């Protein structure tokens, strides 16, 4: 249902940052952590690539550290660019995106 | 109230007189540009005799000034046509009539 949330991009972006910040949370059990990670993966699969710009900006600062917390963002980035490669590579961009 | 503006010259010698049948081809439009009558569409020339008041008085003077074979443009003021009463369903009241008349022959 997050496919066409362009009109509420400010709230959606805040939601993505909060769930991502929850994933990088101490005192979280392994079972709880994967639920947060699964939610973040699901959200980024349907949200338009243009609305993921701010989340990517945060990931640029964190992923190159390559600590134990970098495992989930690596998988998140892999799925994002594989799905939305036309958005970045083709001069005309992805269709209707 | 008839002004005769020439379109194509005729012989310039023979003119219709009283009691002589005039054979003409005409196309009549209102002065704003709306056509209402034309003998070309019926593909039959219109015949009338001068002096018998068969046609509107504007045609009486207008055709009399033309020569055989001449094509002219006659602008008739409302007074020299149907005027205030007009032609119901065809010509509105107080309408100036413009005619493109060619005098084919006299008989």
């Amino acid at each position: 249902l997050f496919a066409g949330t362009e009109h509420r991009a400010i709230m959606v972006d805040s939601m993505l940052h909060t769930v991502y910040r929850l994933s990088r949370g101490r005192s979280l059990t392994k079972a709880q952590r994967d639920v947060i990670e699964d939610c973040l993966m699901a959200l980024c699969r349907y949200i338009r690539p243009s609305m993921l710009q701010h989340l990517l900006r945060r990931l640029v600062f964190d992923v190159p550290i390559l600590n134990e917390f970098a495992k989930m963002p690596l998988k998140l980035l892999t799925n994002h660019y594989e799905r939305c490669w036309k958005y970045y590579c083709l001069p005309t961009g992805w269709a209707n995106f | 109230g008839v002004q005769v503006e020439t379109i194509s010259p005729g012989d310039g010698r023979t003119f219709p007189k009283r009691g002589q049948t005039c054979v003409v081809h005409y196309t009549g439009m209102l002065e704003d540009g709306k056509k209402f009558d034309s003998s070309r569409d019926r593909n039959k020339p219109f015949k009338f005799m001068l002096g018998k008041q068969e046609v509107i008085r504007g045609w009486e003077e207008g055709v009399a000034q033309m020569s055989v074979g001449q094509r002219a443009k006659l602008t008739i003021s409302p007074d020299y046509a149907y005027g205030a009463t007009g032609h119901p369903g065809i010509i509105p009241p107080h309408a100036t009539l413009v005619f493109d008349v060619e005098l084919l022959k006299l008989e």
Binding site: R21, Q53, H54, R57, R58, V60, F61 | -
Partner: protein, 204 residues
């Protein structure tokens, strides 16, 4: 793909380290520019008022939605003039601390008749220093912003990001401020000096 900003800090949550210049002595041999441009930036604010279509006033008021203490130089108190120079003072400290010597090639010298604009272009080497200075504007801005925010330990300001990471729309604040200072140094002839890569070599 060729990145417009083909440069990096090559450094290393996020802690923006400012530039230490209070420890080192500030050279005052160019004080003819230090004091003049310090009040010239506020002088440009007077020109900003006539563009706001609301003029300057003497009485303090919140209804004019402008600077309430902006006064003509005949009746302009120097108490505000002697406190508005501080941002310029550290601005000159900042650009001279990064091993960038400044030399006065030339030797000379209520409305700011000379108009300071920012729509003109400039050379790449000199503009790169201005953008680096604009980065120092942001990290110092980020430093003081995060000091108030760090008392909680949860959450962060949305603009607490490295200067290269933030887009241009949120960059124009520090970008124009650094460029405007460089534009003032341009028409007067201040030479500050501490690459040449073609577009083909900049491709990914």
């Amino acid at each position: 793909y060729v990145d417009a900003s083909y440069s990096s800090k090559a450094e290393k949550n996020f802690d923006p380290r400012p530039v230490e210049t209070l420890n080192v002595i500030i050279p005052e041999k160019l004080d003819s520019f230090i004091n003049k441009f310090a009040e010239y930036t506020h002088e440009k604010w007077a020109f900003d008022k006539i563009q706001n279509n609301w003029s300057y006033g003497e009485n303090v008021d919140e209804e004019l939605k402008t600077h309430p203490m902006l006064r003509p130089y005949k009746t302009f108190s120097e108490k505000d003039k002697e406190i508005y120079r501080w941002p310029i003072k550290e601005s000159l400290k900042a650009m001279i601390a990064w091993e960038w010597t400044i030399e006065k090639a030339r030797e000379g010298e209520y409305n700011p008749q000379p108009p300071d604009l920012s729509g003109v272009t400039l050379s790449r080497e000199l503009q790169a220093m201005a953008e680096q200075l604009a980065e120092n504007y942001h990290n110092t801005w980020g430093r003081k912003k995060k000091q108030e925010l760090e008392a909680k330990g949860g959450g962060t300001h949305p603009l607490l990001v490295p200067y290269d990471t933030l887009t241009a729309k949120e960059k124009a604040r520090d970008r124009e401020k650094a460029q405007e200072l460089l534009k003032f140094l341009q028409m007067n002839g201040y030479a500050v000096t501490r690459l040449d890569t073609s577009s083909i070599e900049k491709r990914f």
